[PDB]
């Protein structure tokens, strides 16, 4: 999920944006 | 060295920015 | 799913994330 | 530049942001 993607690892803008809505 | 990781409030706050009008759902664990 | 921000997608990404600071874009 | 960092390569949010102002 986003923590694994963006906190443990480094995430790109569109990976982040994918968690929107 | 400078940190690229978004954790905690920093991640919420990124979400807040990139999602703008779309909103977002978030759960801190 | 593309990680890479290219071309007019890059300028759009900056539009977004810079908000009221705005930004300087140059391709070179 | 922004093109080496975010297009050729993959940038983090903070790397992208670093190009603001």
Author numbering:
A (entry chain A), D (entry chain C): 1 to 21
B (entry chain B): 1 to 29
C (entry chain D): 2 to 29
Study text:
Insulin plays a central role in mammalian biology, and has a widespread impact on blood glucose levels, lipid and protein metabolism, cell growth/differentiation, and life span2. The evidence for the structural impact of the crosslinking in the analogues reported here comes from three crystal (analogues 2, 10, 11) and two NMR (analogues 8, 12) structures.
Because the B24–B29 to B26–B29 shift of the crosslink bridge yielded the high IR-A affinity analogue 8, possible larger gains in receptor affinity upon moving the crosslink further towards the C-terminus of the B-chain were expected and investigated by the B27–B29 (i + 2) cyclization of insulin. Interestingly, the B27–B29 linker does not significantly affect the overall or local (e.g., B20–B26) insulin structures; the linker allows even the formation of typical insulin dimers with usual dimer-interface hydrogen bond patterns. Any structural variability observed here is characteristic for all other known insulin oligomers. However, in contrast to 2, the B24–B30 chain of analogue 10, when modeled on the B24 site of IR-bound insulin (not shown), can, somehow, be accommodated on the L1 surface, and its further reconfiguration will diminish clashes with the αCT-segment. Therefore, the shortening of the crosslinked sequence and its shift towards the very end of the B-chain in analogue 10 alleviates the conformational stress observed in 2, allowing likely a more effective contribution of the B24–B26 part of the B-chain towards its interaction with IR-A.
